């Protein structure tokens, strides 16, 4: 997790009267605030692909370049589908569901 502190919101300063002037009340109301925190954590995307010894031999072309590419790609697409509409249960929640929530 990574927790950062979000500064608390503004609180007004009281308008003291004229009778108050000359008394402890002249100093006015206390303005008091507590820092709040926002927490960041991580989810996981993972995929597996498996060239058997034999497919490699049963092809005129190599076939593992594709695997590794289609591998990296699968991860990129996945972050993407989810960052859009990711429900958020074990997937990153996403901009279009983040919106529904708000």
């Amino acid at each position: 997790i990574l927790t950062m502190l979000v500064e608390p919101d503004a609180g007004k300063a009281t308008w003291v009267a004229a009778s108050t002037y000359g008394t402890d009340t002249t100093t006015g109301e206390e303005v008091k605030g507590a820092l709040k925190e926002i927490h960041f954590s991580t989810y996981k995307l993972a995929a597996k692909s498996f060239i058997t010894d034999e497919t490699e031999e049963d092809a005129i072309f190599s076939l593992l370049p594709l695997l590794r590419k289609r591998l990296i790609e699968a991860h990129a697409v996945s972050i993407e589908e989810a960052f859009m509409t990711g429900d958020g249960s074990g997937k990153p929640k996403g901009l279009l569901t983040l919106a529904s929530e708000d």
């Binding site: 498996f50 058997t52 497919t55 049963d58 092809a59 072309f61 076939l63 289609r70």
Partner: protein, 44 residues
């Protein structure tokens, strides 16, 4: 097409080495075409 691989080939055609080596079977033996001598006729 060897589909157990996770990255299979397009069609079996890319899983073969089409080799152009032409082989033929034992082939009948020709015996009487040439046992006989030849008369070089030069007229009908």
């Amino acid at each position: 097409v060897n589909q157990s691989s996770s990255v299979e080939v397009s069609s079996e055609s890319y899983e073969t080495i089409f080799s152009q080596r032409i082989i033929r079977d034992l082939q009948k033996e020709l015996v009487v075409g040439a046992l006989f001598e030849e008369l070089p006729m030069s007229s009908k």
